[PDB]
Symmetry: C3
Subunit: 490 residues, 3 copies
Amino acid sequence: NSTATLCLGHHAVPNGTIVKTITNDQIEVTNATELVQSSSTGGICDSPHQILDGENCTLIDALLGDPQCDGFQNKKWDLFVERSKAYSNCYPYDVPDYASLRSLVASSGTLEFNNESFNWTGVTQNGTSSACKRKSNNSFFSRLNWLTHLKFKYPALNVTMPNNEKFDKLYIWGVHHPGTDNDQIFLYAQASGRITVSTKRSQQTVIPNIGSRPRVRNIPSRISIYWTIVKPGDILLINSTGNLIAPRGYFKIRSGKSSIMRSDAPIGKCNSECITPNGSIPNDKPFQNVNRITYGACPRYVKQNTLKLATGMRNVPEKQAIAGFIENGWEGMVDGWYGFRHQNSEGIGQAADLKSTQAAINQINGKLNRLIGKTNEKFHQIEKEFSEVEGRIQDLEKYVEDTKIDLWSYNAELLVALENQHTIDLTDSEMNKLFERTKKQLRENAEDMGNGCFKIYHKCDNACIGSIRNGTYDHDVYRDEALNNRFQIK
Amino acid sequence: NSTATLCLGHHAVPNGTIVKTITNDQIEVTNATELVQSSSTGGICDSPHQILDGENCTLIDALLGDPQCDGFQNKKWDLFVERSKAYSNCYPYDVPDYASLRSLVASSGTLEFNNESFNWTGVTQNGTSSACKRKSNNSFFSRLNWLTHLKFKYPALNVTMPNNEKFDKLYIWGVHHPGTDNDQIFLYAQASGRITVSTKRSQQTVIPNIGSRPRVRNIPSRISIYWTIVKPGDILLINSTGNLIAPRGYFKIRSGKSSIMRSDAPIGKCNSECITPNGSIPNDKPFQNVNRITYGACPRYVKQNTLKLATGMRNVPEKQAIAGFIENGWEGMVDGWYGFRHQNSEGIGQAADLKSTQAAINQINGKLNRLIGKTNEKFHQIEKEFSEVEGRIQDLEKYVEDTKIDLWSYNAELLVALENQHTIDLTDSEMNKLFERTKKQLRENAEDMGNGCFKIYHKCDNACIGSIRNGTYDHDVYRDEALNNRFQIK
Amino acid sequence: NSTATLCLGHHAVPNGTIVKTITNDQIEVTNATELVQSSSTGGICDSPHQILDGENCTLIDALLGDPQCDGFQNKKWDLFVERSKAYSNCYPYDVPDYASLRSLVASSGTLEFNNESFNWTGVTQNGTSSACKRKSNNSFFSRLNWLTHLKFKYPALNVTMPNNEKFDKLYIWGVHHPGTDNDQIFLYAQASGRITVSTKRSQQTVIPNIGSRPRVRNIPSRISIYWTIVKPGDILLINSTGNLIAPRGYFKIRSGKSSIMRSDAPIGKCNSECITPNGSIPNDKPFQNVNRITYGACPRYVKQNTLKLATGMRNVPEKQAIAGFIENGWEGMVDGWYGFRHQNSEGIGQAADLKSTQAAINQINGKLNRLIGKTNEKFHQIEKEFSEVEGRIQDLEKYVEDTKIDLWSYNAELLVALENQHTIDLTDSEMNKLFERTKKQLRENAEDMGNGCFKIYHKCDNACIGSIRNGTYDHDVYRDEALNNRFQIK
Ligand SMILES: *[C@@H]1O[C@H](CO)[C@@H](O[C@@H]2O[C@H](CO)[C@@H](O[C@H]3O[C@H](CO)[C@@H](O)[C@H](O)[C@@H]3O)[C@H](O)[C@H]2NC(C)=O)[C@H](O)[C@H]1NC(C)=O
Ligand SMILES: *[C@@H]1O[C@H](CO)[C@@H](O[C@@H]2O[C@H](CO)[C@@H](O[C@H]3O[C@H](CO)[C@@H](O)[C@H](O)[C@@H]3O)[C@H](O)[C@H]2NC(C)=O)[C@H](O)[C@H]1NC(C)=O
Ligand SMILES: *[C@@H]1O[C@H](CO)[C@@H](O[C@@H]2O[C@H](CO)[C@@H](O[C@H]3O[C@H](CO)[C@@H](O)[C@H](O)[C@@H]3O)[C@H](O)[C@H]2NC(C)=O)[C@H](O)[C@H]1NC(C)=O
Ligand SMILES: *[C@@H]1O[C@H](CO)[C@@H](O[C@@H]2O[C@H](CO)[C@@H](O)[C@H](O)[C@H]2NC(C)=O)[C@H](O)[C@H]1NC(C)=O
Ligand SMILES: *[C@@H]1O[C@H](CO)[C@@H](O[C@@H]2O[C@H](CO)[C@@H](O)[C@H](O)[C@H]2NC(C)=O)[C@H](O)[C@H]1NC(C)=O
Ligand SMILES: *[C@@H]1O[C@H](CO)[C@@H](O[C@@H]2O[C@H](CO)[C@@H](O)[C@H](O)[C@H]2NC(C)=O)[C@H](O)[C@H]1NC(C)=O
Ligand SMILES: [C]C(=O)[N][C]1[C]([O])[C][C@]([O+]#[C-])(C([O])=O)O[C]1[C]([O])[C]([O])[C][O]
Ligand SMILES: [C]C(=O)[N][C]1[C]([O])[C][C@]([O+]#[C-])(C([O])=O)O[C]1[C]([O])[C]([O])[C][O]
Ligand SMILES: [C]C(=O)[N][C]1[C]([O])[C][C@]([O+]#[C-])(C([O])=O)O[C]1[C]([O])[C]([O])[C][O]
Ligand SMILES: *[C@@H]1O[C@H](CO)[C@@H](O)[C@H](O)[C@H]1NC(C)=O
Ligand SMILES: *[C@@H]1O[C@H](CO)[C@@H](O)[C@H](O)[C@H]1NC(C)=O
Ligand SMILES: *[C@@H]1O[C@H](CO)[C@@H](O)[C@H](O)[C@H]1NC(C)=O
Ligand SMILES: *[C@@H]1O[C@H](CO)[C@@H](O)[C@H](O)[C@H]1NC(C)=O
Ligand SMILES: *[C@@H]1O[C@H](CO)[C@@H](O)[C@H](O)[C@H]1NC(C)=O
Ligand SMILES: *[C@@H]1O[C@H](CO)[C@@H](O)[C@H](O)[C@H]1NC(C)=O
Ligand SMILES: *[C@@H]1O[C@H](CO)[C@@H](O)[C@H](O)[C@H]1NC(C)=O
Ligand SMILES: *[C@@H]1O[C@H](CO)[C@@H](O)[C@H](O)[C@H]1NC(C)=O
Ligand SMILES: *[C@@H]1O[C@H](CO)[C@@H](O)[C@H](O)[C@H]1NC(C)=O
Ligand SMILES: *[C@@H]1O[C@H](CO)[C@@H](O)[C@H](O)[C@H]1NC(C)=O
Ligand SMILES: *[C@@H]1O[C@H](CO)[C@@H](O)[C@H](O)[C@H]1NC(C)=O
Ligand SMILES: *[C@@H]1O[C@H](CO)[C@@H](O)[C@H](O)[C@H]1NC(C)=O
Ligand SMILES: *[C@H]1O[C@H](CO)[C@@H](O)[C@H](O)[C@H]1NC(C)=O
Ligand SMILES: *[C@H]1O[C@H](CO)[C@@H](O)[C@H](O)[C@H]1NC(C)=O
Ligand SMILES: *[C@H]1O[C@H](CO)[C@@H](O)[C@H](O)[C@H]1NC(C)=O
């Protein structure tokens, strides 16, 4: 007796978690949170982005007007979703630079189409085919006009359409490649010649090529699809003597945040900002390992499947006389992160220190605020999966994406290691500061026992201990008693 | 009396600035400096890079030799500046892969042209047009030679030009697409056929296509422009029966640091290393938010419009008995960053500590030296703005640039937060070190009062205090007096 | 006498090395290690990757079956090495999009070829040329079949080959462009017409173009090479009336980690994971400045030619009474990094502290483990050197690579500065912790002399000093003696 003990300490928990810092590959802390999103619901939420499910139609089929795609006429989207099951069911066609037409329409985000009255004097309009049935009748692409001879004549077409609007017009047109010379004459009444579609700023000349291709839906012929954008004040000129699959008008072309994604995920009635081909994913976390293909406010794609951010201090078991923080945590300290234990004339007691606890918690919450719920939006990007071998351009698309992902993965690894080191440092610092504050209060009335405790060399009852904890302890009151006890001969 | 007080402290200023660190989203420091350049003069400085202002000419117009561009013949540049007002005023033309020819000429940095004597036996040379007037006379592109029939014959051309130089030759040539069959015969005396331009390593065959395009400067015909590079030891071969717009010789093609930029900024008589389309910008700062398009030694483009680097310590107001640094700065400390305040028999005094002040200043100046005036040069890059919709290739160019900017923006954000944390840490450290040095000098002659001051338990006049400040205080001299005062019963 | 001195200290070495930290551009440490690989042996090791040395053959020559490349038939590779000396020695040819065919074959990693029996009824097969000698006889590309007229007839070919396999087939074919009309008739018995090669999903039509090109190996004609990939369930259709250089079958096309590299480095009998055009390089270091072109588990390319990672503490010379660590290292401390020096009744002694030494060494070894021998593999990428001027696509390839390298170079610079600062901090910390532990043990029996030493105010013989070093010193045993000595009047 005639003395008291005051220990400074911090909490510990029975179920700590392992994180990485700059100092340690593995260090156990009291708590952590995951920064890599690794699951999806598996459905694409239909809100808040405007989703257009292609069903059996690709975007290009919906553009040309395949009859199974008639329900898509004039629709808009933020995200057009193309399904793996999609198939063409009209005249067999190809699109030189298909990927680019798909991209530009996808990014435009609209199928709005305005009919125009082209002057097709001297030919038959509206050719149809049993390969393109609409309501069980022979038909054709809705937005295209198959012109054939009239009374066994096909006079040279030289047809104009000015753009007197204040917006751009996108024209889609085609060239028919007949299977045989017999079809050429049957359809156009004369041998094939070139088609030239021009503006003041552009020209495209295409040669029809007669010949059998392998039959697709029993058709050995083909249509090749082309496009032309016409600016305000410019003029579309179409020049042909046959084989022309004419436009019926133009598509509006807009700019904004629209895109296209390949996915078989079902569309759900729900709300989620981030879309991936695997489904929508929560965007609370800064990183994700679900898919490199994303649309909307999304976490950044990284290679790691987990990155744990420390949200508490180092977790240190209790050693099995009271003792302080030196190689020792306090599992029984449940109402604070830091505090005091004492032994005096009135017993052994514990109290949490609110200031130090709140200081650590505030700083941790600060870094959570920077990292959680702070994702940025991206929209139309580049393609990142490919169904065909292409060489140079695809090599570059792949390398650009690989490069980006490795750089982000590195940033994520370093960021978490740095933040975790800072959390360990700031929580260690709050303990050290509390110890030093207490040391300073006690002046010459106590000695440091080396275990995170002070031996107070005077009687220090519950109110006295509370005065130390509260910062109102007056060392002068006890100094005579303390010095006598400290510097006595034994 | 019989004692003195010695406080350690640091300065504070009335007008501090807010910065970000790893610990704090907002912390006030005594001073900071801006690391993002956000303004431009608005003019492109004509020094130290060689500027060529295109005025009404695009580079390609200057290459072909549009008469309004005659003043550009043979000129070189570091940066060719194309103006939005530029317009063609010669025969209407297009360039398949215009962007590439523009790029390669821009990067080459020269319009040097060497005439060669091609053997055009049997045709008429130097065709002209009222669509391409030079000094009010019908004329044509200076570097091109419009060949037409001679005496209603156009014999098959098969013309050679060896490269016996030790450098590459760039040839620019064309194909004339006449508006009508009548023009074809009037000009070339026979029906159109293909043109083949070849070397030992390459071949290009082009088909003239007769037909009306929309009139441009009253001309429904077109010229399509092509290019061929011929290596030393190789041979250009030109094979044609009409429609050939022949080269008059070759352009030198060089390699170096030349580029091209679209800008309407006026050119000024001034000197600046970094050029953007908005004008030249100072390059003292490591980052800039003026334009992603740059030429020369330029700060790196980031999305942030401000990033403040701390250049002083935490700014802490004075609490309103002398007191030291514990939650308290000294606004009256104007000749140093750190120092001493004392109270003794002779009054209350202040003195700056030079060593600690210079230590902080030196470290801050060190990081300024790494960050300020250290930009790196870039020259010809990729295009970053586009006037036409193109799809795939443009999608990739845009994504590469977006990717780069987001990565640099992240680096900039982290760098400044890390540096600012280090500045706060190093300035706090200098204060702590000064306090600890002083504590060690004083030995058993003083006690820590907890407010950044020592109670010195002996008479310590001005010279004595100075001895402490100077590091020459001899604790043994005063220890008997001090111990008697410290360990007295009161 | 009646007292002892105990100093805490750390080692120093006579040959320290300069590194960079966040605090200091240059600080000398006791040791460092290089993180940038800057040399190569100069040979490409033939293990563990499967190397195929092209010798005089490009990959495309080996594909087509140039007779000097016959030894390559059906071979596979991880890395195909093309030599600058390589040359074609068969019929002169070109490949529109050569770079892409080269890339896709390179990435596929196999020349496996399966013959098929095409129905060439009505034509002569196996045309040969003195321009393509095999064992001194006129011959031709092994994988191609030069068809010519039979009995002065060349009937219209319309030939099919179904893919009934479960893998893709790559077909290589060509179009012959004869030098003259005489050759056209001599070979094909009629005027030239188009060739169409099609599948259910693709069509390619090519026009033979008659004309002299500059002679290559005395041949003014040319063959243009094309390719077609045919999926399971699809069908190749070949439609021609002449000028067809027919396939003899197909190449397997595989996917995996194969690539191609341009290098003149000799191939050696050795084992190395990382290949560059300069030769194989060790992959222990995380970065390298040898070549941006790499294959395998390679350090990342950076611009720096050296980055030194500190592997020891700050190196501080000995000041020329024992003294501790304050501005002073101990060159004579050779069995530990940290330790104790003492002066007592029995002499002056030194002992290393094992715990502190091992703590620093362990942490440094930890960071070495993260950085050394941890490279990641990359395989087929993009090309990074170019022999011809191309404009837009090449501009983008170059910019993507420059962008990547600058970002990695920045990461490397920051990483090393951060790690070195952490090493300085952790080694300084071990010294400070040892001093503080000792202070705590000594309680009221010693005073801090300010030079990293304690004055112990009692007789403290060798065993006593050892008790302090061992952590078993009992301050209570000596406290009466120590207090009497400390607080005596002199
Ligand atoms: C060039 O060769 C092609 C492949 O041999 C050939 O296409 C094939 O044509 C046959 C006959 O028309 C089709 O077979 C059809 O046979 C009966 C005809 O009564 C139909 O009822 C069936 O539906 C059946 O399809 C093949 O389908 C077709 N093969 C392919 C791959 O398309 C071309 O006809 C040939 N071209 C010329 C100009 O002769
Ligand atoms: C194919 O159709 C084109 C568009 O209708 C047409 O071009 C137009 O030609 C007319 C008549 O030459 C031009 O009008 C000109 O009329 C008088 C003629 O005396 C001139 O003095 C005027 O300057 C005026 O320009 C149009 O300008 C022109 N329109 C366009 C868009 O180019 C072609 O002539 C037609 N082609 C053929 C082969 O008939
Ligand atoms: C179009 O012009 C070409 C270039 O003038 C020309 O090619 C040249 O043809 C000559 C004559 O055949 C070749 O010279 C050869 O002369 C004797 C003939 O007995 C040979 O023994 C020699 O080996 C020698 O090569 C040139 O080599 C050749 N030049 C080039 C660059 O290829 C074409 O023949 C011309 N085309 C037409 C259709 O006339
Ligand atoms: C583009 O249209 C023009 C104008 O109709 C065509 O020009 C003529 O075509 C007919 C039949 O081929 C000739 O009888 C006329 O003599 C031609 N000239 C004129 C001035 O009418 C032209 O053929 C068309 N071009 C293409 C490629 O289809
Ligand atoms: C390339 O030039 C050659 C050589 O002049 C041309 O060859 C001939 O052209 C004339 C007229 O068309 C014929 O009478 C000759 O019989 C051809 N052969 C020779 C050996 O002279 C050829 O037409 C030119 N090719 C092109 C595409 O313009
Ligand atoms: C593709 O093959 C078909 C079928 O052999 C060719 O068609 C004919 O060719 C001959 C001679 O040119 C004509 O007499 C026939 O009347 C054509 N039709 C049919 C049904 O046999 C065709 O020419 C070939 N196409 C090409 C571009 O070579
Ligand atoms: C447009 C036209 O012409 N169409 C026709 C129809 O109507 C019918 C038929 O039958 C056979 C189908 O449907 O298919 O046909 C057609 C045509 O003519 C053909 O197909 C072409 O090839
Ligand atoms: C080269 C030539 O030829 N040129 C000519 C001239 O001289 C004149 C005229 O008028 C009509 C003009 O100028 O334009 O014309 C020309 C030509 O011929 C034409 O134009 C083409 O188309
Ligand atoms: C395939 C064929 O035809 N081949 C031939 C041979 O046999 C021989 C000769 O001589 C001349 C050589 O070798 O070259 O020729 C040939 C051919 O014919 C030619 O060359 C083509 O041009
Ligand atoms: C762990 O940390 C997270 C983030 O602050 C928090 O939401 C969660 O409540 C914490 N868990 C516990 C058991 O304290
Ligand atoms: C799509 O096509 C499939 C297969 O023919 C058909 O069964 C299904 O009903 C179609 N779905 C829609 C939405 O039209
Ligand atoms: C349509 O074109 C014809 C033929 O060129 C022309 O004569 C006529 O003016 C046009 N018809 C109408 C209704 O404008
Ligand atoms: C998402 O889909 C991709 C692509 O098919 C697949 O590789 C990945 O494992 C999926 N991830 C999840 C979480 O479903
Ligand atoms: C603030 O910092 C900058 C950079 O060191 C310096 O140039 C400027 O003089 C400082 N301002 C003041 C008021 O000290
Ligand atoms: C460029 O063209 C404009 C418009 O015709 C003309 O007024 C101006 O003088 C021209 N400028 C130069 C530098 O030739
Ligand atoms: C020009 O070409 C002609 C026709 O091919 C040829 O005969 C003659 O040698 C050439 N003229 C000169 C001056 O070399
Ligand atoms: C520079 O020009 C760009 C492109 O027009 C514009 O977005 C930007 O606001 C300009 N910046 C400044 C500082 O003038
Ligand atoms: C220097 O550091 C490296 C890496 O730990 C080590 O391999 C080497 O032995 C050290 N050199 C000396 C002289 O200690
Ligand atoms: C390659 O060609 C050179 C030059 O003709 C020849 O001397 C050498 O033997 C050839 N090498 C091989 C491996 O065939
Ligand atoms: C080869 O093609 C010919 C001509 O088209 C055809 O008649 C015949 O069936 C084919 N020959 C064989 C052996 O199958
Ligand atoms: C490797 O080769 C490249 C390309 O030729 C050259 O720039 C570089 O200096 C070489 N490096 C070494 C270490 O040999
Ligand atoms: C096709 O053109 C005809 C003129 O033949 C026109 O009356 C009709 O509206 C168009 N549409 C259909 C479905 O026939
Ligand atoms: C054009 O060629 C002629 C030969 O007709 C030549 O004398 C003259 O120098 C050339 N230039 C001009 C401007 O006529
Ligand atoms: C070429 O085709 C012939 C038929 O003419 C066939 O017998 C032979 O195997 C083939 N190969 C060679 C080298 O002639």
